[PDB]
Design a protein around this motif. Sequence first.
Motif, short mmCIF file in Angstrom:
data_model
loop_
_atom_site.label_atom_id
_atom_site.label_comp_id
_atom_site.label_asym_id
_atom_site.label_seq_id
_atom_site.Cartn_x
_atom_site.Cartn_y
_atom_site.Cartn_z
N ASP A 97 9.00 3.74 11.91
CA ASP A 97 8.02 4.82 11.84
C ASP A 97 7.57 5.02 10.39
OD1 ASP A 97 9.93 6.52 10.48
OD2 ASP A 97 10.54 7.45 12.36
N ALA A 98 6.58 5.89 10.21
CA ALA A 98 5.91 6.01 8.91
C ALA A 98 6.89 6.43 7.81
CB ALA A 98 4.76 7.02 9.01
N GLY A 99 7.81 7.34 8.12
CA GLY A 99 8.74 7.80 7.10
C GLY A 99 9.75 6.74 6.71
N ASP A 100 10.34 6.08 7.71
CA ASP A 100 11.26 5.00 7.41
C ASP A 100 10.56 3.86 6.69
OD1 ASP A 100 13.40 6.33 8.43
OD2 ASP A 100 13.16 5.50 10.48
N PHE A 101 9.34 3.52 7.13
CA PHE A 101 8.62 2.42 6.50
C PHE A 101 8.34 2.73 5.04
CE2 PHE A 101 5.01 -0.08 5.18
CZ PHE A 101 5.31 -1.33 5.70
N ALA A 135 0.83 -1.20 0.00
CA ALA A 135 0.00 0.00 0.00
C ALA A 135 0.87 1.25 0.00
CB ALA A 135 -0.94 0.00 1.20
N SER A 136 1.95 1.24 0.78
CA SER A 136 2.85 2.39 0.81
C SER A 136 3.50 2.59 -0.55
CB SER A 136 3.91 2.21 1.89
OG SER A 136 4.86 3.27 1.84
N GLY A 140 -2.83 1.35 8.69
CA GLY A 140 -3.01 2.79 8.81
C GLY A 140 -1.77 3.48 9.33
N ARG A 141 -1.20 2.94 10.42
CA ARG A 141 -0.02 3.55 11.03
C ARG A 141 1.19 3.49 10.10
NH1 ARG A 141 4.12 0.70 13.59
NH2 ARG A 141 2.71 -1.12 13.60
#
Lengths: 226, 227
Positions: A205-209, A24-25, A55-56
Amino acid sequence: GGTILVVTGTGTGVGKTVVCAALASAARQAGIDVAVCKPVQTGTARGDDDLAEVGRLAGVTQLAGLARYPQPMAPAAAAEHAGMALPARDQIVRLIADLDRPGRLTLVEGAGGLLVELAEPGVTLRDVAVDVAAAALVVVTADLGTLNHTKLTLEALAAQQVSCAGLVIGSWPDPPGLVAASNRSALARIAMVRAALPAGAASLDAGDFAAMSAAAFDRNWVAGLV
Amino acid sequence: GGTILVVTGTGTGVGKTVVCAALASAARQAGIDVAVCKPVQTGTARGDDDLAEVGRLAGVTQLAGLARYPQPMAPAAAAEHAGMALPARDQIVRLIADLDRPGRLTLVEGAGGLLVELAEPGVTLRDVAVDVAAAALVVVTADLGTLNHTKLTLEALAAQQVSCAGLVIGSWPDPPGLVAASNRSALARIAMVRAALPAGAASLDAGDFAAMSAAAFDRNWVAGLVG
Ligand SMILES: Nc1ccn([C@@H]2O[C@H](CO)[C@@H](O)C2(F)F)c(=O)n1
Ligand SMILES: Nc1ccn([C@@H]2O[C@H](CO)[C@@H](O)C2(F)F)c(=O)n1
């Protein structure tokens, strides 16, 4: 409509949720609209919430589900112990069909594997995939036993002419190790390995992921999904 | 011939080898001539030897091997790593046919799942079971994931018209938890559960293991395996 993929694991604790989040990302970073559907969540008693993890980790907001069961069991066993029946076949197929739209990648995450009962009466994730004409993305390990589990799943998919959209190794260890290194090669011989997600990725976290996800998949395959 | 059963597992370390020894021991105690066959053994450089463990646990001496590979991997990768070839199909098939004989139960233990490549080229344990008209005993767990693994296995068996001889839960906890009890109930609805072997059976001595084995299976089923 758009593209519906079912995402199904060759076992439990295989990384199926993080694979949903990572695809999804990656699809969002290529400018694709993404929905994830988890029709039946189990294991809520111990805190499972796959839609919230998606979501996270990936920022998806179209997150749809129909039922949640406390027990860490397959849906039919969780519903039986709860004394409350699974969602109906029409409920699952129509939710996914209404989620689906042009320009959108809709991921349907299973619970308990491809062939177990997901909706009553006796309807499986495989049946759902046939009904909505989804291909199936198969999440696997690189550990001993993966080859049998993968060949078995691919046979089950072919048996109802569900297209296989490829394999994703849900957790790639560091360092790889002798068996995992051989299996990654062997898996590539029976199907396309779309990605191998580094071990520990769910903790990012969201940015690293999103960084991990953009690099994990072939950019052209992602963009071609829709 | 006699009765040939392939014994295969839904995954790794589900107790295939203890089930082979337990069924061999129960059958011997019913007066049945028992042979155990392991045509492909991997992991020998780590000390893995399923035939030897079967003889230790159950006292079987009619043990037949064929291929042995050092690394603890799937047969095709373990063979390649050692610079060796897999056996040919007729090498596995003749090994079994020579053991098979009237009055005998020949148990053929697989190596790494039903569809893993056993003989070159691309011959699996399912293909072998077809060739020798053996039914398949499927060894499973009671943990989450078992129902899918078991249904995948049964569907692959039926796709080639290999009869399912039933299930065996290779390790059964005492006490069983909620998940284990629910899964065993669901397993028994998709096939016959022939036995659920107590956890830690491999640490029993000869006499305790034989008694566990006689109590673990239905007497009438074991006796009816061979005519
Ligand atoms: N690439 C991956 C794959 C999985 N995981 C984590 O391992 C647990 C078992 O699936 C998952 O619950 C987990 F997601 F926590 C991870 O951290 N990174
Ligand atoms: N009923 C059982 C089943 C298994 N085992 C032991 O667990 C390992 C993998 O099954 C086997 O290698 C083991 F044999 F050591 C056991 O002791 N008793």
